[PDB]
């Protein structure tokens, strides 16, 4: 009836998979998925904030951050 997880993380399929049966595996899997998404977002925004010095253009990122595309110059 209420949740805060962003929608682009797939859970309704995982809900039909393991929400009714083996709830523990359901929670473990969603924990893994959210951890992976958080790590990807942290890497992305850490790159954007810190190492933008040698970057020559904005990086194109998906909300789930499955695909990353950027350009960089190294001296």
């Amino acid at each position: 009836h209420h949740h805060s997880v962003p929608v682009f993380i797939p859970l309704e399929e995982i809900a039909a998979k393991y929400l009714q049966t083996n709830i523990q595996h359901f929670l473990f899997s969603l924990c893994e998925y959210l951890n992976a998404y958080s790590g990807r977002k942290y890497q992305a925004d850490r790159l954007q904030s810190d190492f933008a010095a040698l970057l020559t253009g904005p990086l194109q990122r998906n909300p789930l951050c499955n695909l990353l595309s950027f350009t960089y110059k190294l001296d």
Partner: peptide, 15 residues
Amino acid sequence: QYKPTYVVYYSQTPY
């Protein structure tokens, strides 16, 4: 240009 329409899309979303 007098009868336009607007569509809002969210990436990797089912809506």
